[PDB]
Amino acid sequence: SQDYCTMLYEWLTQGILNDPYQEFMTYDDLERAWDTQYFIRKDVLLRDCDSEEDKNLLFKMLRTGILLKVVRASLQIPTIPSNSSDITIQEINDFADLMEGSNLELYVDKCYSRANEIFLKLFFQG
Amino acid sequence: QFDLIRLNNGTIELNGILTPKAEVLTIEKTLNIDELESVHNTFLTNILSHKLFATNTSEISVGDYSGQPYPTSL
Numbered sequence: 001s002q003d004y005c006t007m008l009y010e011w012l013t014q015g016i017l018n019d020p021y022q023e024f025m026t027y028d029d030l031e032r033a034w035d036t037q038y039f040i041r042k043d044v045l046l047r048d049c050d051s052e053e054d055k056n057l058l059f060k061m062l063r064t065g066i067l068l069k070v071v072r073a074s075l076q077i078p079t080i081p082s083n084s085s086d087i088t089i090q091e092i093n094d095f096a097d098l099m100e101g102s103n104l105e106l107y108v109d110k111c112y113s114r115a116n117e118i119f120l121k122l123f124f125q126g
Numbered sequence: 127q128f129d130l131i132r133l134n135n136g137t138i139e140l141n142g143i144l145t146p147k148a149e150v151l152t153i154e155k156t157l158n159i160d161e162l163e164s165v166h167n168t169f170l171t172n173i174l175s176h177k178l179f180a181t182n183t184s185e186i187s188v189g190d191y192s193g194q195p196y197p198t199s200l
Contacts, residue, residue, distance in 0.1 A: 032142070074146060084151055118151065126146025 001095035009092050012061060012111040014079055015068025026062055034073065038062065046099070057105055060112050067115040071122055080118060087114040129155065 007024055010016040017026060025045050029036040040049065040058070047054045071080060082088045089110055098104050129141040157165070173179070178196040180186035186195050 071151075073143065075151065076145075081152065121151055122146060125149050126151065 005092040005095050005098070008061075011065040012108065013068070013089050013114070015065040015070070015072055015115070017065065017069075025058070026065070034070075038066075057108060061108050064108065064112040064115040067119040071115075071118055074122060074126070085114050085117045085121075087117060089114060 004023070007018065010018065011024070011026070017024070017028070019027065022041070023044055025039075025041045027039045027041065040062075042049060045058070047057075049055050049058055068080060072078070087110060089107075092098055092107070098107060131139040131141050133139060177186060178200075181195045181197055188194050189196060189199060192199055
């Protein structure tokens, strides 16, 4: 799961989608025209998307990366540094632990909060 | 400061992404060689794109009652 986790991390902290083998949920078009459709590969999900709680989590993860994607595009930068916010997020180095319950949601919430912190600073200042 | 494109349908398009202000979280629109040539070609093309000069094409309406390209009559 180590690379999977890395891929997830970058999605959530950088807004980077990089999936050459099509293993990640959240794929889009093109590879202007920024309002593209995102697709959820139900079949590669870690959890079902039938419960309300997991749907909400999936969407939060999705939004997190999108806001970051917007910021990277807006600032014309390859990456958003940790010092861009007061929220710094560690890498996922233990998948099994992340999947132990509650930890995933919080990890994502931190990522999400950070994405909004950065995003909003841009929108209300930039 | 806004680079705006006017479209024939009235749309004013910002030419690209709206950039942030100088205040950020952390130049001149000059032309290059091809761009200069392009502007010039565009210009001459535009002169000759006016309907009255399209004498080399079936697209020119050949007058209406005379049946001829406007320059024939002119």
